[PDB]
Amino acid sequence: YADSFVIRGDEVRQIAPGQTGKIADYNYKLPDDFTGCVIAWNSNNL
Amino acid sequence: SSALGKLQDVVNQNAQALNTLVKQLSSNFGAISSVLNDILSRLDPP
């Protein structure tokens, strides 16, 4: 499963297994039993 | 009517062990408390 989107530069630590935050508590969640990789790269030039 | 120590000792040993078993339900073993309703109230599931 490739989940692809764009976020604010701050809550890149909000995509992680097990956490609390306004991005993680309302718009996207990962289980604490996560197994996979998370890749993030900057974008204001696109 | 005025000696049954061998019968008294086996009663005493069993009671002394059963009390030590219950008195262990109030040790931390290196945790924040001894109550599960206190770790399930000031900590998130992770």
Q: How many other C-beta atoms are found inside a 10 Å radius of the C-beta of residue A14?
A: 19
Which residues fall within 8 angstroms of residue A3, CB to CB, at 6 or more apart? A28
Copy the structure tokens of residue A10.
Answer: 């701050």
Copy the structure tokens of residue A5.
Answer: 């989107």
| Number of residues that make up chain B | 46
Q: How many other C-beta atoms are found inside a 10 Å radius of the C-beta of residue A15?
A: 20
Q: Which residues of A touch B44 (CB under 8 A)?
A: 18, 20
Distances (CA, A) of A28 to A9, A13, A25, A35, B30: 15, 12, 7, 16, 34
Q: d(Cα B34, Cα B27) in Å, to the nearest integer?
A: 6
Of the candidates A41, A39, A32, the one whose C-alpha atom is nearest the C-alpha of residue B45 is: A32
> Hey, is the C-beta of B43 within 8 angstroms of any chain A C-beta?
no
For B29-45, b/e burial (b = at least 16 CB within 10 A) is eeeeeeeeeeeeeeeee
